[PDB]
């Protein structure tokens, strides 16, 4: 099955997923200067006041906290996007070292974690319906650097324990998302994919100008889930990212000047 190891990570995964190698794969690398801001681009609108956290999972990649998407509670809209997309998950990339883990990079460089606010567009009624068309959905990221301590991302690393290995859960209520956004929503954007298998070209992605910062013990203890079972060997979860691909034919926007 596939993975970030060296017998089944990235450079693996165009064997069982060919669009691994289509014409619009993320995460890509933003050529800053090579962006074009879009003056047309409207702002973006980010409503998560109504957000309904339930739980908090180790799938065995990344840790995902899940959100109740059966109705119009946290949306986003606006900026590139037509039409009202939901949050129905939120997850991090991050490396085993300060200098490397995210996945989109900005002038080729790397931050140490990279937050994906995962959002399905209304009109396909379901996240699986979404994920099969070219504007299903809308994934916001947010880059991670290591310095002062974010106190909105706290109750995250304070339940990890709690779900050091694969399929492991946690109830995960009354967490506010609106705690883990930087002040400025200046972004680039383009039309992308998942950055994990199934490798769906599914994505409009909307990547923050402004990182956040968090600590060195908030991503040290990041570090400390496993990508394994229970009562199997341990393997660190870090590093579970995916490098940057082929822009290929597309032009980064900016919203921004
Ligand atoms: C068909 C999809 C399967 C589901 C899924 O949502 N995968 C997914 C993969 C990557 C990103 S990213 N890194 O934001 O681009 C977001 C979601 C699954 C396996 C149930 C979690
Ligand atoms: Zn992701």
Redesign the pocket.
């Given at each position: 099955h596939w993975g970030y190891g060296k017998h089944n990570g990235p450079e693996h995964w165009h064997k069982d997923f060919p669009i691994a190698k289509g014409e619009r794969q993320?995460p890509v690398d933003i050529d800053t200067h090579t962006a074009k801001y879009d003056p047309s681009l409207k702002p973006l609108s980010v409503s998560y006041d109504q957000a309904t956290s339930l739980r908090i999972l180790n799938?065995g990649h990344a840790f995902?906290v899940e959100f109740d998407d059966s109705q119009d509670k946290a949306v986003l809209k606006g900026g590139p996007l037509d039409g009202t997309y939901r949050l129905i998950?939120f997850?991090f990339?991050w490396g085993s070292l300060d200098g490397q883990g995210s996945?989109h990079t900005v002038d080729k460089k790397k931050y140490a974690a990279e937050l994906?606010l995962?959002h399905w567009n209304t009109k396909y009624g379901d996240?699986?319906k979404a994920?099969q068309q070219p504007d299903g959905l809308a994934?916001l990221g947010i880059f991670l650097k290591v310095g002062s301590a974010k106190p909105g991302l706290q109750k995250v690393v304070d339940v990890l324990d709690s779900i050091k290995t694969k399929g492991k859960s946690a109830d995960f209520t009354n967490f506010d998302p609106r705690g883990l956004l930087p002040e400025s929503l200046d972004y680039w954007t383009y039309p992308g994919?998942?950055?994990?298998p199934?490798l769906?070209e599914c994505?409009t992605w909307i990547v923050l100008k402004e990182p956040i910062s968090v600590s060195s013990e908030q991503v040290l203890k990041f570090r400390k889930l496993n990508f394994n079972g229970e009562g199997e060997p341990e393997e660190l979860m870090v590093d579970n990212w995916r490098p940057a691909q082929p822009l290929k034919n597309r032009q980064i926007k900016a919203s921004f000047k």
């Open positions: 993320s799938n995902n998950q997850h990339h996945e994906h995962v996240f699986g994920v994934v994919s998942l950055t994990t199934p769906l994505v």
